[PDB]
């Protein structure tokens, strides 16, 4: 009766340290639609993150894109934190340039 | 262009 979200964290453009880009967290395949998504910079919530309009795939599972401008560096760590009824605790997925 | 939906 419920479907847990898939989560991908990635950049809009190929990551280049020092160059402005967009950080994306795509949550998909979930049901029901209630969901909480944060983007993190060094463990802390990024403010004013925007998101797409609630839609779904032809199998009825919901998807949302959360996004914010960011300038990647060697040291800064980014991640996406997701909560949904199917999750006992928030799930954190780290941004990895190679994914 | 949207469609008028019907009552279920």
């Amino acid at each position: 009766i419920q479907r847990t979200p898939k989560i991908q964290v990635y950049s809009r453009h190929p990551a280049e340290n020092g160059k402005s880009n967009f950080l994306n967290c795509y949550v998909s395949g979930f049901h029901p639609s209630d969901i909480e998504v944060d983007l993190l910079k060094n463990g802390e919530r990024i403010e004013k993150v925007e998101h797409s309009d609630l839609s779904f795939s032809k199998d009825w599972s919901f998807y949302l894109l959360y996004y914010t401008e960011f300038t990647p560096t060697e040291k800064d760590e980014y991640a996406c934190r997701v909560n949904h009824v199917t999750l006992s605790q928030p799930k954190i997925v780290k941004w990895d340039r190679d994914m | 262009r949207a469609k008028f939906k019907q009552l279920l």
């Binding site: 809009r12 967009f22 839609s55 009825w60 | 262009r1 469609k3 939906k5 019907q6 009552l7 279920l8």
Partner: protein
């Protein structure tokens, strides 16, 4: 060269937190062109595509009227569905619908769609004939008999064969520079050692539109479906999409693997290998 117009509607009750939220988002292929959200603070400006701007305020008014009526209809439908399933007033429930049409490169109707789901489960669908219904259960049979009595299929058919096709064709014309442009994937292969013994080959597709794409790995020319990790196609935020496919290969055997890419924007399909 084929295209689709589709509306994806979600109505969700929230007892104790006001009336059910209704949101309808309209797409031409993978381009959202309209949104109506009953929770939006100021409509407008709810987003609309550029090539929608030229249609004028009467067009906006008409669509807004339909969305507002749909909001009420879906709220009443949610009340009916609660009863059909003997459900309590305490829980949240979700009614979703998809409707619209597919056309070919010549703009002719391929088929229409009008179907629903309740709480994530298929509920009722207009059949491809645009005349008859398929109901999933005894609750949806109630809807089916109501829709049969009111000759609803006939109304849906008129929209799907008429309005839907005529407006999709218009949008395609007016938005031809984007809607009828396929952007091919930019592709490359990366190599990621796991151990002394094996490494991941990851084949990337970036910057493509529309979202439909085929990305596969072969070993010695044989499909590696079972051994390939294929992530879901994902939006970049600039209208384009991204995808990758990965295989784990034995050290030194990388040249036996080929990545294959098909997409509407490519003059011809790609074959790629790791290039160290």
């Amino acid at each position: 060269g084929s295209h689709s117009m589709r509306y994806f509607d979600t109505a969700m009750s929230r007892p104790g937190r006001g009336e059910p939220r209704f949101i309808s988002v309209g797409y031409v292929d993978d381009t959202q062109f309209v949104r109506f959200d009953s929770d939006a603070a100021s409509p407008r400006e709810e987003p609309r595509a550029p090539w929608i701007e030229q249609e004028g305020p009467e067009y906006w008014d008409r669509n807004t009227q339909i969305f507002k009526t749909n909001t009420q209809t879906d709220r009443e439908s949610l009340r009916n569905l609660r009863g059909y399933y003997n459900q309590s007033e305490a829980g949240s429930h979700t009614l979703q619908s998809m409707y619209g049409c597919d056309v070919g490169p010549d703009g002719r109707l391929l088929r229409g769609h009008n179907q629903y789901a309740y709480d994530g489960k298929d509920y009722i669908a207009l059949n491809e004939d645009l005349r008859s219904w398929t109901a999933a259960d005894t609750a949806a049979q109630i809807t089916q008999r109501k829709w049969e009595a009111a000759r609803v299929a006939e109304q849906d058919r008129a929209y799907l064969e008429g309005t839907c096709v005529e407006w999709l064709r218009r949008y395609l014309e007016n938005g031809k520079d984007t809607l009828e442009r396929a952007d091919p994937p930019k592709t490359h292969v990366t190599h990621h050692p796991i151990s002394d013994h094996e490494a991941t080959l990851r084949c990337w597709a970036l910057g493509f539109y529309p979202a439909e794409i085929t990305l596969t790995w072969q070993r010695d020319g044989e499909d590696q479906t079972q051994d390939t990790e294929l992530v879901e196609t994902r939006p970049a935020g600039d209208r384009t999409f991204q995808k990758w496919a990965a295989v784990v290969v034995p050290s030194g055997e990388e040249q036996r693997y080929t990545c294959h890419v098909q997409h509407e924007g490519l003059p011809k399909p790609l074959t790629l290998r790791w290039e160290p």
